[PDB]
Amino acid sequence: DIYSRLLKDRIIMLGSAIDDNVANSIVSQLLFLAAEDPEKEISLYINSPGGSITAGMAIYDTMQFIKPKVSTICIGMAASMGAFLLAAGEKGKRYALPNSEVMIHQPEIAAKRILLLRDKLNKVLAERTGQPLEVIERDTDRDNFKSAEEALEYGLIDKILTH
Amino acid sequence: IYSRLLKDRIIMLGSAIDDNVANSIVSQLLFLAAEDPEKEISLYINSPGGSITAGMAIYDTMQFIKPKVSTICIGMAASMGAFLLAAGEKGKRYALPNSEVMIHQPAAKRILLLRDKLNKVLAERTGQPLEVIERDTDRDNFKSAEEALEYGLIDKILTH
Amino acid sequence: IYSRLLKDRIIMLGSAIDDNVANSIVSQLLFLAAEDPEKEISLYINSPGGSITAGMAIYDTMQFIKPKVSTICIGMAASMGAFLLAAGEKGKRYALPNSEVMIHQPAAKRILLLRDKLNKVLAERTGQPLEVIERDTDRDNFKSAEEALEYGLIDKILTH
Amino acid sequence: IYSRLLKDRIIMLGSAIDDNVANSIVSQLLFLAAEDPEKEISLYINSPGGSITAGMAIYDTMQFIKPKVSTICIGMAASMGAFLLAAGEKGKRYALPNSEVMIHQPEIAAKRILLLRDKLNKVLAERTGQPLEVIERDTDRDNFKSAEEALEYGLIDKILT
Amino acid sequence: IYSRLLKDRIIMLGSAIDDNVANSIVSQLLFLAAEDPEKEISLYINSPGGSITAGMAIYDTMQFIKPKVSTICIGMAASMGAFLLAAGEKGKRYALPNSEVMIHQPEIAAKRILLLRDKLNKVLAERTGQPLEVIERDTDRDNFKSAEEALEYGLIDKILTH
Amino acid sequence: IYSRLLKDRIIMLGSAIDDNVANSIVSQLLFLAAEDPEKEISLYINSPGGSITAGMAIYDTMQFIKPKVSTICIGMAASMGAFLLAAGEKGKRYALPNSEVMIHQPAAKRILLLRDKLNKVLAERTGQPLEVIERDTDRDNFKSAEEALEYGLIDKILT
Amino acid sequence: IYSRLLKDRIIMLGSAIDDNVANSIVSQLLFLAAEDPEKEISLYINSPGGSITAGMAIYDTMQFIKPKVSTICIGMAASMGAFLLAAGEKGKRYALPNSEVMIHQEIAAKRILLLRDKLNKVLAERTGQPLEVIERDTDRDNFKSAEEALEYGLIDKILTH
Amino acid sequence: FSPXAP
Amino acid sequence: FSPXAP
């Protein structure tokens, strides 16, 4: 019911791990909200431990494709593909709460596609964050946690919500 | 949840294709054609594939109904999914930039009949020799949106 | 899905036929005849077949109600599904081009003479003399849309 | 997805008869009689039969309520189902042309079901019109009938062709 | 479901009586009495019986609420179902013609069962007119009773036919 | 069913008291006080008892809310149930004629501290000396509706 | 459930705090602030505690929304439940007389460490209590009573007769 | 089944 | 989180 109220307000809640069911859910909601008003914003709230790289790449592609801008907001934690979806939000509308945390660490389908998707993830990260590619390469390979401050400085968010 | 999507004439095929998924997609197709026989349908495909009989029934319904069925690959279109993608309307077959499409494709006389027909339709809709469509739907493969557009599986890549 | 199909006077028989499916289909038929006792019904069949009593209940309901029941084979009409296809309204029995129909029908005395009662309905509806039907029933072999058409199980083949 | 049938004063007995189905049918009958005590009810029967006590609960309710309960055999009426069919209102017992009816029949005390059974035999005899002896014999014996045979036996009145 | 029969002030006791059934019946009784303290309630009984404590809770509630509780045996009223049937409003205790009634009666302290047993047999004595010894003897043994022998004994007031 | 019961400002405590039953009863009490802070609540008790922490949470919420909480023992009020019955509003603690009430009662230091506070509140409610409560709630015993009146656990027996 | 309770701007935190409970509480807080940004919220806490990241989500949300969030400990507030109690609005942090509060209290252990230190520092500012006594009291197995908790800085006032 | 039921 | 997310 709270999810329904949020959706009437063009709000999507990604509060669980990302597998194919969550991917289809978020994708359907994105497409629906864009069908209702192609030029009104969507806000994607992220409290996700991360998950499947293919599912997350699906969500990311849909975010790009729809005409609305998708602002992203980190509530509790954005890890793995959740951190990537956060960093892939609308220019200027990437937010985190003060005590939020962001680890861009990232752990039946052919291995080759996994490698190639991982490389697109890497380069998209580099362009949206400004870091040299090789740096994004290293940091998405090691366990490492940042905070709203350190993330913002890294360029994974655009603003912290204070006061 | 998806009921609201049905109103915009959008059908979501996000799971593997068995008899249940097929009857539902066929149901929704027939419904949308009843509500308006000459307005488009959009079929979003994120499917690992599945049963050849189920998918072929969805293929038949796509043909029969008077509306044009645009097909859009979101995450992945494999096996029958890929086929259903390649069998969307002329000019309205789409894939997102990071989509992937493996036409690879895994009750004996009938499977063979349906398979030969599937390869024929793939060969006409892609512009490929049947002897090639036989080859590539037999060896496990994986193709980019870019490889798929030049193969003839999609008509455009939805960029920006 | 089915709630909204029901408004367009469409009934979906996409599962095997047992007493639950039979009660469902019967109730929907009666309901649709109550809402309008002179407007068509369309029964889409994608069924592996099943109980002979259940199927016969569906058949009796189809006869009794005032509307004509067009039947349409989407994927496959086997056993009682094939029978319910052949028992649709004259002129409004349809199949899709890759549809397939096997009229092969799998208390002992009761089942025997019930099978025998089925074959004779199939005969009067199709036109085949009821030897032609006993041999086919005792046989594992399926017919395409064109075959079923020549045979009398179908009225028209759907492709606009 | 049966309440719309309930509204047209139609009850659906499509499963085997145990205490849950009995309570359901009894509640629906009482409800339809509370809404209008003098407007018909239609009981559609597609049942393999079942518990003799459950079916006798249903039968008792059919008698007690003021409305007339027409019964219609759709697919099959066996054991108590058949009984519930034969116990429908005078003149309003129907079967569809390919319906089948087997009055054959198979926690509580022995003597209880025993004279309960003698009772439903006497009721079948008055409704069909056959000698008790003959209802008595054809219940302890596997047998099946079509609408054409049932109506000859007494279990239905008219066939809906 | 029953949600609608409750509006007509009808309660359905069609299962064995345990603490969940007891709480449900007590809640429905209190509810119906809150909605109209002086309009009748009808309790339809088709019960194999069950817990003596749960049943006694239902019995107490029936007494306490201002409305009269008419009881109606549909299929069977055994054990605490039979007791609840016999304990319905004076003059409004009914049974259908083929109904049957066995007053046979088989986490909680043991002494409490003896005292509740006493008051059960006592209330039955009062309600059926039976002399106490007869109830004590008859709630000690299995015995079926058709609506006729029930009406005779005094467990119901009237049988329902027309 | 109880949705509608809740509209007549009636709460049903018919099961054993654990944290879920607690939270339920607490939420209902707070809700009913929010809807009308000066209209009565009727708590019907048919409970075997249970957790001393969860039962004492309900007790605290009964005090705090402005309404008077009349308690009514239907079948049996045992352990915390009994306590909750004895903790009802002055003059509006009731039992039915065949109701029965056993005040027997089964970090760890907290459960002991709560036990002592329970004994103190109970002694105040009954009027009996604590010294006896401290032993009575230690014994397997059961009072009748009448005996309960005499003790001070209830102050009126319903006809 | 507890939707009726929501209407009265009351939130119930009666279970352990994980990400689901979090998201629930967060959504309800945001909703109540949307409905009326300047009317109070009452958060009742009967929680054994739980995840530090989930609880921290809830805390951030409490800060951000315009309404004042009064917190009330009913049965027990442990771990992040105690932290959420202590983080209620100034002057509107309550406990019932027999409540108990123990501030005793997938993810890197180094991160757990820094998280804890930040938590300690918030509790310090929130109770007016030296950080060293805050860090020492989360090593103990002590539980503060309602009154003990009031003279420590965890709640503003106790409500009784 | 009407006519005639109901 | 409005103002301003949205």
PDB file of N, CA and C in Angstrom, chain B residues 95-155:
ATOM      1  N   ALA B  95      15.985  -3.116 -29.668  1.00  0.00           N
ATOM      2  CA  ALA B  95      16.767  -3.636 -28.556  1.00  0.00           C
ATOM      3  C   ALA B  95      17.451  -2.468 -27.870  1.00  0.00           C
ATOM      4  N   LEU B  96      17.559  -2.536 -26.548  1.00  0.00           N
ATOM      5  CA  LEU B  96      18.301  -1.509 -25.833  1.00  0.00           C
ATOM      6  C   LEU B  96      19.803  -1.747 -25.981  1.00  0.00           C
ATOM      7  N   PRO B  97      20.621  -0.715 -25.751  1.00  0.00           N
ATOM      8  CA  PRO B  97      22.040  -0.811 -26.151  1.00  0.00           C
ATOM      9  C   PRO B  97      22.787  -2.000 -25.570  1.00  0.00           C
ATOM     10  N   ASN B  98      22.546  -2.352 -24.308  1.00  0.00           N
ATOM     11  CA  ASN B  98      23.257  -3.449 -23.670  1.00  0.00           C
ATOM     12  C   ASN B  98      22.476  -4.754 -23.699  1.00  0.00           C
ATOM     13  N   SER B  99      21.383  -4.811 -24.456  1.00  0.00           N
ATOM     14  CA  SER B  99      20.661  -6.060 -24.629  1.00  0.00           C
ATOM     15  C   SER B  99      21.567  -7.113 -25.256  1.00  0.00           C
ATOM     16  N   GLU B 100      21.165  -8.373 -25.111  1.00  0.00           N
ATOM     17  CA  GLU B 100      21.845  -9.481 -25.762  1.00  0.00           C
ATOM     18  C   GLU B 100      20.804 -10.456 -26.290  1.00  0.00           C
ATOM     19  N   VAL B 101      21.151 -11.124 -27.388  1.00  0.00           N
ATOM     20  CA  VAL B 101      20.231 -11.979 -28.126  1.00  0.00           C
ATOM     21  C   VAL B 101      21.000 -13.214 -28.567  1.00  0.00           C
ATOM     22  N   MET B 102      20.683 -14.363 -27.982  1.00  0.00           N
ATOM     23  CA  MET B 102      21.230 -15.638 -28.427  1.00  0.00           C
ATOM     24  C   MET B 102      20.091 -16.428 -29.053  1.00  0.00           C
ATOM     25  N   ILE B 103      20.128 -16.570 -30.382  1.00  0.00           N
ATOM     26  CA  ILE B 103      19.122 -17.368 -31.080  1.00  0.00           C
ATOM     27  C   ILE B 103      19.353 -18.855 -30.912  1.00  0.00           C
ATOM     28  N   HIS B 104      20.410 -19.256 -30.202  1.00  0.00           N
ATOM     29  CA  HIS B 104      20.592 -20.663 -29.881  1.00  0.00           C
ATOM     30  C   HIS B 104      19.271 -21.244 -29.397  1.00  0.00           C
ATOM     31  N   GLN B 105      19.063 -22.520 -29.672  1.00  0.00           N
ATOM     32  CA  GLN B 105      17.752 -23.100 -29.422  1.00  0.00           C
ATOM     33  C   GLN B 105      17.852 -24.604 -29.218  1.00  0.00           C
ATOM     34  N   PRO B 106      17.590 -25.101 -27.997  1.00  0.00           N
ATOM     35  CA  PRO B 106      17.587 -26.555 -27.770  1.00  0.00           C
ATOM     36  C   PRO B 106      16.512 -27.272 -28.591  1.00  0.00           C
ATOM     37  N   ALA B 107       6.174 -35.969 -29.240  1.00  0.00           N
ATOM     38  CA  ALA B 107       7.156 -34.888 -28.988  1.00  0.00           C
ATOM     39  C   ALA B 107       8.485 -35.241 -29.657  1.00  0.00           C
ATOM     40  N   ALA B 108       8.472 -35.653 -30.931  1.00  0.00           N
ATOM     41  CA  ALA B 108       9.680 -35.994 -31.726  1.00  0.00           C
ATOM     42  C   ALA B 108       9.427 -35.570 -33.174  1.00  0.00           C
ATOM     43  N   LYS B 109       8.347 -36.030 -33.825  1.00  0.00           N
ATOM     44  CA  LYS B 109       7.944 -35.574 -35.151  1.00  0.00           C
ATOM     45  C   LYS B 109       7.465 -34.126 -35.091  1.00  0.00           C
ATOM     46  N   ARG B 110       6.759 -33.778 -34.014  1.00  0.00           N
ATOM     47  CA  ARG B 110       6.204 -32.439 -33.873  1.00  0.00           C
ATOM     48  C   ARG B 110       7.284 -31.403 -33.590  1.00  0.00           C
ATOM     49  N   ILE B 111       8.217 -31.717 -32.685  1.00  0.00           N
ATOM     50  CA  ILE B 111       9.324 -30.804 -32.438  1.00  0.00           C
ATOM     51  C   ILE B 111      10.074 -30.532 -33.736  1.00  0.00           C
ATOM     52  N   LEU B 112      10.335 -31.585 -34.522  1.00  0.00           N
ATOM     53  CA  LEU B 112      11.101 -31.399 -35.755  1.00  0.00           C
ATOM     54  C   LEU B 112      10.343 -30.523 -36.746  1.00  0.00           C
ATOM     55  N   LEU B 113       9.042 -30.774 -36.910  1.00  0.00           N
ATOM     56  CA  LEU B 113       8.212 -29.920 -37.754  1.00  0.00           C
ATOM     57  C   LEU B 113       8.325 -28.457 -37.340  1.00  0.00           C
ATOM     58  N   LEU B 114       8.036 -28.188 -36.061  1.00  0.00           N
ATOM     59  CA  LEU B 114       8.048 -26.819 -35.557  1.00  0.00           C
ATOM     60  C   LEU B 114       9.422 -26.182 -35.713  1.00  0.00           C
ATOM     61  N   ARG B 115      10.485 -26.960 -35.505  1.00  0.00           N
ATOM     62  CA  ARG B 115      11.834 -26.423 -35.625  1.00  0.00           C
ATOM     63  C   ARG B 115      12.126 -26.003 -37.056  1.00  0.00           C
ATOM     64  N   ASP B 116      11.795 -26.859 -38.023  1.00  0.00           N
ATOM     65  CA  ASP B 116      12.029 -26.495 -39.416  1.00  0.00           C
ATOM     66  C   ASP B 116      11.246 -25.235 -39.782  1.00  0.00           C
ATOM     67  N   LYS B 117      10.006 -25.123 -39.287  1.00  0.00           N
ATOM     68  CA  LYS B 117       9.212 -23.923 -39.554  1.00  0.00           C
ATOM     69  C   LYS B 117       9.829 -22.685 -38.907  1.00  0.00           C
ATOM     70  N   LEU B 118      10.295 -22.816 -37.663  1.00  0.00           N
ATOM     71  CA  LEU B 118      10.946 -21.703 -36.982  1.00  0.00           C
ATOM     72  C   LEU B 118      12.169 -21.236 -37.753  1.00  0.00           C
ATOM     73  N   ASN B 119      12.971 -22.176 -38.252  1.00  0.00           N
ATOM     74  CA  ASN B 119      14.164 -21.790 -38.996  1.00  0.00           C
ATOM     75  C   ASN B 119      13.790 -21.112 -40.310  1.00  0.00           C
ATOM     76  N   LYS B 120      12.716 -21.571 -40.955  1.00  0.00           N
ATOM     77  CA  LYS B 120      12.259 -20.912 -42.179  1.00  0.00           C
ATOM     78  C   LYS B 120      11.840 -19.471 -41.907  1.00  0.00           C
ATOM     79  N   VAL B 121      11.059 -19.258 -40.847  1.00  0.00           N
ATOM     80  CA  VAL B 121      10.580 -17.908 -40.559  1.00  0.00           C
ATOM     81  C   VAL B 121      11.739 -17.011 -40.148  1.00  0.00           C
ATOM     82  N   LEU B 122      12.676 -17.542 -39.356  1.00  0.00           N
ATOM     83  CA  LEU B 122      13.869 -16.778 -39.010  1.00  0.00           C
ATOM     84  C   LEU B 122      14.643 -16.386 -40.260  1.00  0.00           C
ATOM     85  N   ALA B 123      14.766 -17.311 -41.220  1.00  0.00           N
ATOM     86  CA  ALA B 123      15.531 -17.026 -42.428  1.00  0.00           C
ATOM     87  C   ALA B 123      14.840 -15.972 -43.288  1.00  0.00           C
ATOM     88  N   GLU B 124      13.507 -15.971 -43.327  1.00  0.00           N
ATOM     89  CA  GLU B 124      12.844 -14.938 -44.122  1.00  0.00           C
ATOM     90  C   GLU B 124      12.872 -13.585 -43.419  1.00  0.00           C
ATOM     91  N   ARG B 125      12.690 -13.569 -42.097  1.00  0.00           N
ATOM     92  CA  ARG B 125      12.616 -12.309 -41.368  1.00  0.00           C
ATOM     93  C   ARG B 125      13.984 -11.678 -41.133  1.00  0.00           C
ATOM     94  N   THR B 126      15.070 -12.454 -41.178  1.00  0.00           N
ATOM     95  CA  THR B 126      16.407 -11.887 -41.017  1.00  0.00           C
ATOM     96  C   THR B 126      17.113 -11.603 -42.333  1.00  0.00           C
ATOM     97  N   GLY B 127      16.764 -12.298 -43.412  1.00  0.00           N
ATOM     98  CA  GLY B 127      17.509 -12.158 -44.637  1.00  0.00           C
ATOM     99  C   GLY B 127      18.740 -13.046 -44.665  1.00  0.00           C
ATOM    100  N   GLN B 128      18.597 -14.263 -44.142  1.00  0.00           N
ATOM    101  CA  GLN B 128      19.686 -15.204 -43.987  1.00  0.00           C
ATOM    102  C   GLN B 128      19.357 -16.499 -44.715  1.00  0.00           C
ATOM    103  N   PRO B 129      20.362 -17.180 -45.260  1.00  0.00           N
ATOM    104  CA  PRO B 129      20.104 -18.499 -45.848  1.00  0.00           C
ATOM    105  C   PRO B 129      19.649 -19.482 -44.780  1.00  0.00           C
ATOM    106  N   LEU B 130      18.614 -20.260 -45.113  1.00  0.00           N
ATOM    107  CA  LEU B 130      18.128 -21.271 -44.178  1.00  0.00           C
ATOM    108  C   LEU B 130      19.270 -22.136 -43.664  1.00  0.00           C
ATOM    109  N   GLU B 131      20.252 -22.416 -44.520  1.00  0.00           N
ATOM    110  CA  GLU B 131      21.380 -23.243 -44.119  1.00  0.00           C
ATOM    111  C   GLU B 131      22.248 -22.563 -43.061  1.00  0.00           C
ATOM    112  N   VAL B 132      22.164 -21.240 -42.925  1.00  0.00           N
ATOM    113  CA  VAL B 132      22.867 -20.531 -41.855  1.00  0.00           C
ATOM    114  C   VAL B 132      22.029 -20.487 -40.582  1.00  0.00           C
ATOM    115  N   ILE B 133      20.727 -20.224 -40.730  1.00  0.00           N
ATOM    116  CA  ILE B 133      19.826 -20.200 -39.581  1.00  0.00           C
ATOM    117  C   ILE B 133      19.805 -21.557 -38.892  1.00  0.00           C
ATOM    118  N   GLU B 134      19.872 -22.639 -39.673  1.00  0.00           N
ATOM    119  CA  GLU B 134      20.028 -23.961 -39.077  1.00  0.00           C
ATOM    120  C   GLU B 134      21.301 -24.025 -38.244  1.00  0.00           C
ATOM    121  N   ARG B 135      22.389 -23.466 -38.769  1.00  0.00           N
ATOM    122  CA  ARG B 135      23.688 -23.555 -38.111  1.00  0.00           C
ATOM    123  C   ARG B 135      23.678 -22.829 -36.775  1.00  0.00           C
ATOM    124  N   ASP B 136      23.243 -21.568 -36.777  1.00  0.00           N
ATOM    125  CA  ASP B 136      23.430 -20.718 -35.606  1.00  0.00           C
ATOM    126  C   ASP B 136      22.436 -21.022 -34.494  1.00  0.00           C
ATOM    127  N   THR B 137      21.258 -21.546 -34.822  1.00  0.00           N
ATOM    128  CA  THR B 137      20.320 -21.976 -33.793  1.00  0.00           C
ATOM    129  C   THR B 137      20.665 -23.355 -33.243  1.00  0.00           C
ATOM    130  N   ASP B 138      21.791 -23.925 -33.667  1.00  0.00           N
ATOM    131  CA  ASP B 138      22.259 -25.226 -33.208  1.00  0.00           C
ATOM    132  C   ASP B 138      23.509 -25.136 -32.351  1.00  0.00           C
ATOM    133  N   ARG B 139      24.442 -24.256 -32.696  1.00  0.00           N
ATOM    134  CA  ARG B 139      25.592 -24.004 -31.840  1.00  0.00           C
ATOM    135  C   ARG B 139      25.268 -22.897 -30.849  1.00  0.00           C
ATOM    136  N   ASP B 140      25.643 -23.124 -29.592  1.00  0.00           N
ATOM    137  CA  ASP B 140      25.448 -22.119 -28.563  1.00  0.00           C
ATOM    138  C   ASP B 140      26.199 -20.849 -28.940  1.00  0.00           C
ATOM    139  N   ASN B 141      25.489 -19.723 -28.896  1.00  0.00           N
ATOM    140  CA  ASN B 141      26.039 -18.451 -29.321  1.00  0.00           C
ATOM    141  C   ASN B 141      25.495 -17.351 -28.422  1.00  0.00           C
ATOM    142  N   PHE B 142      25.926 -16.126 -28.703  1.00  0.00           N
ATOM    143  CA  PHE B 142      25.516 -14.950 -27.953  1.00  0.00           C
ATOM    144  C   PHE B 142      25.903 -13.753 -28.787  1.00  0.00           C
ATOM    145  N   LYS B 143      24.945 -12.864 -29.057  1.00  0.00           N
ATOM    146  CA  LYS B 143      25.160 -11.751 -29.959  1.00  0.00           C
ATOM    147  C   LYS B 143      24.782 -10.437 -29.299  1.00  0.00           C
ATOM    148  N   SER B 144      25.586  -9.414 -29.564  1.00  0.00           N
ATOM    149  CA  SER B 144      25.284  -8.072 -29.104  1.00  0.00           C
ATOM    150  C   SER B 144      24.096  -7.495 -29.866  1.00  0.00           C
ATOM    151  N   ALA B 145      23.511  -6.440 -29.295  1.00  0.00           N
ATOM    152  CA  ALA B 145      22.549  -5.639 -30.044  1.00  0.00           C
ATOM    153  C   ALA B 145      23.111  -5.262 -31.406  1.00  0.00           C
ATOM    154  N   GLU B 146      24.395  -4.899 -31.450  1.00  0.00           N
ATOM    155  CA  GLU B 146      25.019  -4.500 -32.705  1.00  0.00           C
ATOM    156  C   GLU B 146      25.138  -5.680 -33.662  1.00  0.00           C
ATOM    157  N   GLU B 147      25.579  -6.837 -33.163  1.00  0.00           N
ATOM    158  CA  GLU B 147      25.615  -8.031 -34.004  1.00  0.00           C
ATOM    159  C   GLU B 147      24.217  -8.441 -34.451  1.00  0.00           C
ATOM    160  N   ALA B 148      23.209  -8.202 -33.612  1.00  0.00           N
ATOM    161  CA  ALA B 148      21.858  -8.650 -33.920  1.00  0.00           C
ATOM    162  C   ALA B 148      21.196  -7.767 -34.971  1.00  0.00           C
ATOM    163  N   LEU B 149      21.434  -6.456 -34.914  1.00  0.00           N
ATOM    164  CA  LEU B 149      20.912  -5.572 -35.950  1.00  0.00           C
ATOM    165  C   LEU B 149      21.480  -5.936 -37.316  1.00  0.00           C
ATOM    166  N   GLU B 150      22.786  -6.200 -37.393  1.00  0.00           N
ATOM    167  CA  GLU B 150      23.366  -6.553 -38.683  1.00  0.00           C
ATOM    168  C   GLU B 150      23.048  -7.985 -39.092  1.00  0.00           C
ATOM    169  N   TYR B 151      22.670  -8.842 -38.148  1.00  0.00           N
ATOM    170  CA  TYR B 151      22.185 -10.166 -38.507  1.00  0.00           C
ATOM    171  C   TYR B 151      20.779 -10.117 -39.094  1.00  0.00           C
ATOM    172  N   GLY B 152      20.013  -9.075 -38.789  1.00  0.00           N
ATOM    173  CA  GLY B 152      18.633  -8.979 -39.211  1.00  0.00           C
ATOM    174  C   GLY B 152      17.609  -9.313 -38.149  1.00  0.00           C
ATOM    175  N   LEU B 153      18.027  -9.445 -36.889  1.00  0.00           N
ATOM    176  CA  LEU B 153      17.107  -9.821 -35.823  1.00  0.00           C
ATOM    177  C   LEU B 153      16.301  -8.639 -35.313  1.00  0.00           C
ATOM    178  N   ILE B 154      16.896  -7.447 -35.289  1.00  0.00           N
ATOM    179  CA  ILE B 154      16.209  -6.240 -34.861  1.00  0.00           C
ATOM    180  C   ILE B 154      16.313  -5.203 -35.976  1.00  0.00           C
ATOM    181  N   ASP B 155      15.522  -4.138 -35.842  1.00  0.00           N
ATOM    182  CA  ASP B 155      15.495  -3.063 -36.827  1.00  0.00           C
ATOM    183  C   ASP B 155      16.186  -1.797 -36.361  1.00  0.00           C
TER     184      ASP B 155
END
